[PDB]
């Protein structure tokens with residue numbers, strides 16, 4: 266069906282470990298979209314063919330306004346191409362570099378949109394496992410959209426693949442290589458809420474070794490400007506024991522969230 270000739274390619278949107286992502290327009294329809302390009306040699310050398318498969322399968326079936334659509338794929342001799350919904354306002358990562366910190370209302374709105382999307386996912390027992398700002402995209406009305414389902418799986422779960430870069434968003438049970446489930450995404454939600462308000466993630470350090478220590482011991486502290494209600498929500502999400510972390514419903518109904526978010530459930 267689809268081939269490279271069906272598209273005109275435009276500017277680079279971003280770079281991943283494997284993904285090189287371009288703006289593109291389909292010739293017959295003039296449909297604007299994003300084209301995620303992957304090198305077959307790189308995928309093979311790293312041995313992550315199963316991740317790509319899961320990304321396509323999971324993200325093509327999901328339908329939710331806060332989850333990025335995947336329309337299709339094709340491949341030639343050297344490359345694989347994923348056909349994605351184009352997110353015109355870019356990444357949450359970028360927006361954070363621009364503004365340094367988000368205010369409480371921006372933060373709570375983003376957390377609600379996140380919790381809504383994750384609730385939809387967990388209902389099918391899909392866990393994302395790689396929730397972080399570079400993988401959170403923004404729509405034309407500024408609405409948050411979860412993307413990059415490469416690490417996602419069905420629960421319960423062990424980990425078969427080597428951890429790549431930053432440990433910053435991962436809970437103790439996943440970095441210690443133990444078994445894990447849905448609550449991993451709840452931990453990550455707490456890490457994000459903190460980073461949104463403060464400008465950096467709670468377990469950030471100079472070395473991999475030190476970050477691992479701070480995560481496994483849950484060693485974090487708050488700046489003075491973080492309010493009582495945000496402290497309450499964040500402290501509930503970052504529990505060492507996954508079973509003590511709240512349900513997503515409790516997050517969406519948390520007093521600080523409801524007082525400050527500009528969107529519903």
Ligand SMILES: Nc1ncnc2c1ncn2[C@@H]1O[C@H](COP(=O)(O)OP(=O)(O)O)[C@@H](O)[C@H]1O
Pocket residue numbers: 278279280281282283284285286299301333349350351352353355356399400402412413415
């Ligand atoms: N649909 C999209 N619209 C706009 N930018 C995107 C889109 N998809 C990815 N990007 C940009 O490209 C980067 C890499 O994409 P991603 O799919 O996360 O690759 P990887 O799987 O290698 O992490 C993202 O961090 C983002 O900056």
Ligand SMILES: CC1=NC(=O)N[C@H](c2ccc(F)cc2F)C1C(=O)N(C)C
Pocket residue numbers: 305308313314315317318321338339340345
């Ligand atoms: C149906 C397919 N048949 C193929 O022969 N190769 C593809 C392939 C699959 C895993 C992979 F890591 C790399 C690949 F090129 C393929 C596929 O499902 N894609 C998602 C591109």
Ligand SMILES: [Cl-]
Pocket residue numbers: none
């Ligand atoms: Cl179409």
Ligand SMILES: [Cl-]
Pocket residue numbers: 422423424425
């Ligand atoms: Cl497993």
Ligand SMILES: [Cl-]
Pocket residue numbers: 423424425426
């Ligand atoms: Cl795995």
Ligand SMILES: [Cl-]
Pocket residue numbers: 384512513514515
């Ligand atoms: Cl729930």
Ligand SMILES: [Mg+2]
Pocket residue numbers: 281399400413
């Ligand atoms: Mg990514």
Ligand SMILES: [Mg+2]
Pocket residue numbers: 281413414415416
């Ligand atoms: Mg990926």
